[PDB]
Amino acid sequence: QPFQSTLWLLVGLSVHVVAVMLYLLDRFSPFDALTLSSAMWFSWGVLLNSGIGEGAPRSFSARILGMVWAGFAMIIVASYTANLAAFLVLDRPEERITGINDPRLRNPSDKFIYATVKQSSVDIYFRRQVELST
Amino acid sequence: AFLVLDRPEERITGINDPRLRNPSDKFIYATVKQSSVDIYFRRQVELSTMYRHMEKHNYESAAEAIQAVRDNKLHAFIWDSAVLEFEASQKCDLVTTGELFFRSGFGIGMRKDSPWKQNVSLSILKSHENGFMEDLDKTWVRYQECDSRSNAPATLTFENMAGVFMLVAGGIVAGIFLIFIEIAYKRHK
Amino acid sequence: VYVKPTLSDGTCKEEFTVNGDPVKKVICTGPNDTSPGSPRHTVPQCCYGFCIDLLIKLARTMNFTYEVHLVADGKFGTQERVNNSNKKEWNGMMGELLSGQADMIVAPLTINNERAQYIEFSKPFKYQGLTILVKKEIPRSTLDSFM
Amino acid sequence: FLEPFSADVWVMMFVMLLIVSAVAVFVFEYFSPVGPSFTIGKAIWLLWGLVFNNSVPVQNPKGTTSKIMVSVWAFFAVIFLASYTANLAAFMIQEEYVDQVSGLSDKKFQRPNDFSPPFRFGTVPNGSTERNIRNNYAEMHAYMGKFNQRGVDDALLSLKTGKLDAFIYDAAVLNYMAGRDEGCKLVTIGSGKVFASTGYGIAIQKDSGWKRQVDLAILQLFGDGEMEELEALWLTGICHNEVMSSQLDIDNMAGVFYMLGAAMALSLITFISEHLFYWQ
Amino acid sequence: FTIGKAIWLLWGLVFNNSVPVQNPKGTTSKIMVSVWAFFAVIFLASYTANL
Ligand SMILES: CCCCCCCC/C=C\CCCCCCCC(=O)O[C@@H](COC(=O)CCCCCCCCCCCCCCC)COP(=O)([O-])OCC[N+](C)(C)C
Ligand SMILES: CCCCCCCC/C=C\CCCCCCCC(=O)O[C@@H](COC(=O)CCCCCCCCCCCCCCC)COP(=O)([O-])OCC[N+](C)(C)C
Ligand SMILES: CC(=O)[C@H]1CC[C@H]2[C@@H]3CC=C4C[C@@H](OS(=O)(=O)O)CC[C@]4(C)[C@H]3CC[C@]12C
Ligand SMILES: CC(=O)[C@H]1CC[C@H]2[C@@H]3CC=C4C[C@@H](OS(=O)(=O)O)CC[C@]4(C)[C@H]3CC[C@]12C
C-alpha cells in the first residue's frame, strides 16, 4: 500500500541496474573482484538488510555506487514506515458529534437516518422549533 | 509523537474564539481609535467585554498597529480585510487568520445634496462591469510574492541535533585518554 | 492612499510600474509628518494609490477638477461627546465633509448606519470586512536533545 | 525525503565521518597494539554503512579503543536514523492539497477554438452574468450559446456527468451550491475569485422616499450583526469548514531516483578519470 | 548449517539484524533467507509505524 505498484517495479529494477553497473565498474577499472553473481547479492542484501553476500566493491568508482545505493536503500525503507505511519495515523473514521448543531448533517439525506419516538416530547420540540423545520 | 504534536497552538482565529471574548492581560488586541470598528464594537451587545479591552489599547493609526504586531507588542489587530490582506501578501512575518465579519464595503462619501451622487455610483458600477477595478486590484492589491502559511512541520536544525554531535566529539576526546590506557595495560600486563 | 514627501523642487517623484505604465500621482496638502499642533505646518506631499487612481478616473468621466488634501485629525470619523463644548460632532474625515472643508471623501470609508444618516455613500467600490492580523509562526522544533 | 534534517546537519555529519575515521585510522589504530590493514577508505566505508542502515559488508578494526570509537559512532547512527524517519513521518502526516485551474483570466475562456480540446462552459441566460459576458467578451458570448443551460440545477449535475467543466453564475449562488454538494466534489476556482463584483439589493421605485429608510434599515442589520446569523442560518455550508493518505508514486519519489541516477554519472566520471590517472 | 544456526539467523533478521550469524552456502537457501529478510523489513516497518 505505501508504494504504488509501479514504484515497486522501479525499486526492483534499479537493483539490477546497480548490480550490473557495479560489475562493469569493478572490472574494467585499472585499479577479490566483484563477479556478476556476487554483485547481485550485494545490491539485494543492501536493500533487504540481510547479511547474504560476503563481497563488497573494490574499485573507487564501484564503492561510490555502493555508498549511494546504501543511502537510497535507507530512504526507501524509511519512507515506507513514514508513509505507513501516515496511513495508520489518519485512517480514522468520523462519528457524529456536537449534537444537532452539527452542520455536516444539518441538511437531510438518505444515507443517514434520523429517528425519534412518535408522539413524545421530542416531537413537540422539533415541531415547535423554527430553524429545526428541515 | 513529539514531532507530530509539536504544534505551537493552532491560531488566534476569529471573534468566535473564546480567547478574544474574555479580556486577558497576556492577549492584547486593538483597533484604530475613532473608526468604524469602534462603532461596531460599541453598538454590539455581547461584545461589551471586548470593547473595554480595546478602549485601553487602541492605536492612533493602522500603520502603527501593524508595526506593533511586527514588534510582538500586539497579537491581534481587528481592521478592514482589504488593508490587512495586503500586509500578509507584502510581509511574510504577518499571516491573516480569521473569518470575515461586519461585511460593509468602501464608498465615496458626499453630503446629502451631492449633485454628483447619481453619476458617481454609476461610474463605480460601470467600472466594476468594465473590469476597471479588476485592473486596479492587480496593480495595487494583488502582489503576492510571499507565501501564506503551511502545516508547520519544522525540520530538525543543527541546534536541535547538536546533542549527538557533541557526544561523538566527546568520544574522540575520551578516546585520547583510552589509547594511553590501552598501551599502558598491555605494558602493565 | 500612499503618502510620500515631495521632492526638493516641489514636484512628484516619477516612478514606473513593473509593467512599464507610469504611476499617477497627485499633490496632497496634508499636515506635518508627526502632527500639526505644535508644528503648525501643512507640508505638501505626493499621493497615489488605488483610491487616487479611482479618483482620477472619476474626474475624467465626470469632467471635474480636484484639490486632494489629507485629514487634519488623521481619523476616519466618529460621533463624540466632548463635554468641553457639550455638543455631538464628527471628527476628522467625517467632520470635514459636513463642515464644508471637503466636497468628497475618496478614501476607505466603510458604509455605516451612523455615517449614512448624515452623509451619503456611493455604491461600494471595495467589498470587504473585518479580520484579524497575527504574526506568522516560524516553525522551530522544541527538541532540546536526543535524550 | 529531503524535508527533515536541514543541510547543515547532513554536511556536519560528513565532517564527523572524516574526523572520526582519520582519528580511528591514524591515532586509535596505529598507536594501539593489534594493528587485514585498516585504512582510511575502509574506515569511511564502515562508518558510512553504519549511518545508512548497516547492511554492507564491512571490515571492523582490531584495537579496543577503535571499537569504542566505532561503537560510539554506531550510537550516533541509531539516533540519526531514528530522528530521520520520525521527522519524515511528521511531514507525511501533515500535508495539504493544491488546485489546477487558474481562473477567468486564462485564455481557455477567451479563445476556445485555436487552443486545446474545446473547453465547454456556459451560463443561464436572461440575467446579469450574460450581460457582462455579452458586453465585455463578445467572442466568448457566442461560444457560450450552445452550452446555455435552463437552470442552476441542470448545470450543477452536468459538471458531474462530464458534460461541463466550468459554470458561470452568481457567486452567492454558486458558492452556496458547492457548499451543500454531497460528496465534496464541486470546488470553485481561486477559493472565491469573484469578477465584476457587485451586490444584491431591493429595487425600489425611482424617486421614492422609502429608499432612504430601507437603506438605513439594511445597514441596521449590518451594524447589529443580524446579517451574520442570517448568513450562518441560511447560507451555511458542509464543506466550507475544510490531510489524506496518498501512496508514493514515481512522481513523489523521483527525487530519490534522480540521486541514484546522478551517482551513476559520478561513478562513470571517476571511472574515466581514474583511467586517465594510471594510463598517464 | 543446522536447525539451531538457522533459527538464530532468522530470529536476528526480524529483530533489526545485529547478531553474529552463520549464513548458508546454497543458492536456494540464500534465496529463502533473502525472501525472509524482506518479510523482516516489512514486519519491523509496520511495527514502528503502528507504534
Ligand atoms: C522497502 C523495503 C525494500 C524494498 C524491496 C523492493 C523489491 C521489489 C522487487 C520486485 C517487485 C516486482 C513487482 C512487484 C509489484 C508488481 C505490481 C504490478 O505490476 O501490479 C500491476 C497490477 O497490480 C495489481 O493487480 C496489484 C499488485 C500486484 C502485486 C503482484 C505481486 C507479485 C509480484 C512478483 C513477486 C516477486 C517475483 C520475483 C521478484 C524478483 C500493475 O502493473 P500492470 O501489470 O501493467 O497492470 C495491468 C495488468 N495487465 C498488464 C495484465 C493488463
Ligand atoms: C510463482 C512465484 C511464487 C513465489 C514468489 C515469492 C516472491 C519472490 C521469491 C523468490 C524469487 C527469487 C528471485 C530469483 C529467482 C531466479 C533464480 C536465480 O537463479 O536467481 C539468481 C538471481 O536472483 C537473486 O539473486 C535473487 C536474490 C533475492 C531474491 C528475492 C528477494 C525479494 C523478495 C520479494 C521482494 C519483492 C516483493 C514485491 C511485491 C511482491 C540467483 O542469484 P545469482 O547471483 O545469479 O546466483 C549465482 C549462484 N551462486 C550463488 C552459486 C554463485
Ligand atoms: C547516500 C547519499 O549520498 C544521500 C543519502 C541522503 C542524502 C541527503 C538527503 C537530504 C539532503 C538535504 C538537501 O537539502 S536541500 O536544502 O538542498 O533540499 C540537500 C541534499 C541532502 C544533504 C542529501 C545528500 C545526499 C545524501 C546524503
Ligand atoms: C554524490 C551524489 O551523487 C549526490 C550527493 C547530493 C545529491 C543531490 C542532492 C539533491 C538533489 C536535488 C534533487 O531535486 S529534485 O527536484 O529533482 O528532486 C535532484 C537530485 C539532486 C541534485 C542530488 C543528485 C545526486 C547528488 C549530487
Swiss-Prot record, chain B:
Write out the annotated subcellular location.
Cell membrane; Postsynaptic cell membrane; Postsynaptic density membrane; Synaptic cell membrane
Glycosylation (residues): N22, N119
Q: Which residues bind glycine?
A: S36, D80
Give the domain of life. Eukaryota
All disulfide bonds of the chain are: C92-C146
UniProt's post-translational modification comment states: NMDA is probably regulated by C-terminal phosphorylation of an isoform of GRIN1 by PKC. Its phosphorylated state is influenced by the formation of the NMDAR-PPP2CB complex and the NMDAR channel activity.
Summarize the disease involvement recorded for this protein: Neurodevelopmental disorder with or without hyperkinetic movements and seizures, autosomal dominant: An autosomal dominant neurodevelopmental disorder characterized by severe intellectual disability and developmental delay, absent speech, muscular hypotonia, dyskinesia, and hyperkinetic movements. Cortical blindness, cerebral atrophy, and seizures are present in some patients.
| Assembly and interaction partners | Heterotetramer; the NMDAR subunits are modular and harbor tiered domains that function in concert to regulate opening and closing of the cation-selective ion channel pore. Forms heterotetrameric channels composed of two GluN1/zeta subunits (GRIN1), and two identical GluN2/epsilon subunits (GRIN2A, GRIN2B, GRIN2C or GRIN2D) or GluN3 subunits (GRIN3A or GRIN3B) (in vitro). Can also form heterotetrameric channels that contain at least two GluN1 subunits and at least two different GluN2 subunits (or a combination of one GluN2 and one GluN3 subunits) (in vitro).
Q: What does this protein do?
A: Component of N-methyl-D-aspartate (NMDA) receptors (NMDARs) that function as heterotetrameric, ligand-gated cation channels with high calcium permeability and voltage-dependent block by Mg(2+). NMDARs participate in synaptic plasticity for learning and memory formation by contributing to the long-term potentiation (LTP). Channel activation requires binding of the neurotransmitter L-glutamate to the GluN2 subunit, glycine or D-serine binding to the GluN1 subunit, plus membrane depolarization to eliminate channel inhibition by Mg(2+).
Question: Record's family?
Answer: Belongs to the glutamate-gated ion channel (TC 1.A.10.1) family. NR1/GRIN1 subfamily.
Q: What is this protein called?
A: Glutamate receptor ionotropic, NMDA 1
**Record organism:** Homo sapiens (Human)
Q: Which residues of the full protein are shown?
A: 653 to 841 of 938
From Swiss-Prot, chain E:
Q: In which tissues is it expressed?
A: Primarily found in the fronto-parieto-temporal cortex and hippocampus pyramidal cells, lower expression in the basal ganglia.
Which compartments is it annotated to reside in?
Answer: Cell membrane; Postsynaptic cell membrane; Cell projection, Dendrite; Late endosome
Residues at site: Functional determinant of NMDA receptors?
Answer: N16
Please describe, based on the UniProt annotation, the reported consequence of changing V19G: In DEE27; severe phenotype with early onset seizures; gain of function mutation; results in neuronal hyperexcitability; the mutant channel is not inhibited by magnesium and has increased calcium permeability compared to wild-type
Which intramembrane segments does UniProt give? 3-14
> In its UniProt record, what illness is this protein linked to?
Intellectual developmental disorder, autosomal dominant 6, with or without seizures: A disorder characterized by significantly below average general intellectual functioning associated with impairments in adaptive behavior and manifested during the developmental period. MRD6 additional features may include seizures, hypotonia, abnormal movements, such as dystonia, and autistic features. Developmental and epileptic encephalopathy 27: A form of epileptic encephalopathy, a heterogeneous group of severe early-onset epilepsies characterized by refractory seizures, neurodevelopmental impairment, and poor prognosis. Development is normal prior to seizure onset, after which cognitive and motor delays become apparent.
Q: What result is annotated for mutating A37V?
A: Reduced localization to cell membrane. Affects glutamate-gated calcium ion channel activity resulting in increased agonist potency and mutant channels activated at lower glutamate and glycine concentrations
* Name assigned to this protein: Glutamate receptor ionotropic, NMDA 2B
In its record, the post-translational modification comment is: Phosphorylated on tyrosine residues.
Q: How does it assemble?
A: Heterotetramer. Forms heterotetrameric channels composed of two GluN1/zeta subunits (GRIN1), and two identical GluN2/epsilon subunits (GRIN2A, GRIN2B, GRIN2C or GRIN2D) or GluN3 subunits (GRIN3A or GRIN3B) (in vitro). Can also form heterotetrameric channels that contain at least two GluN1 subunits and at least two different GluN2 subunits (or a combination of one GluN2 and one GluN3 subunits) (in vitro). In vivo, the subunit composition may depend on the expression levels of the different subunits. Found in a complex with GRIN1 and GRIN3B. Found in a complex with GRIN1, GRIN3A and PPP2CB.
Membrane-spanning parts: 29-48
> How are the domains described in the entry?
The extracellular N-terminal domain (NTD) endows NMDARs with a unique capacity for allosteric modulation, harboring several binding sites for small molecule ligands that act as subunit-specific allosteric modulators of ion channel activity.
Give the span(s) annotated as Pore-forming: 5-24
Cytoplasmic-side positions: 15-28
Write out the coiled-coil annotation as residue ranges.
none
Family label: Belongs to the glutamate-gated ion channel (TC 1.A.10.1) family. NR2B/GRIN2B subfamily.
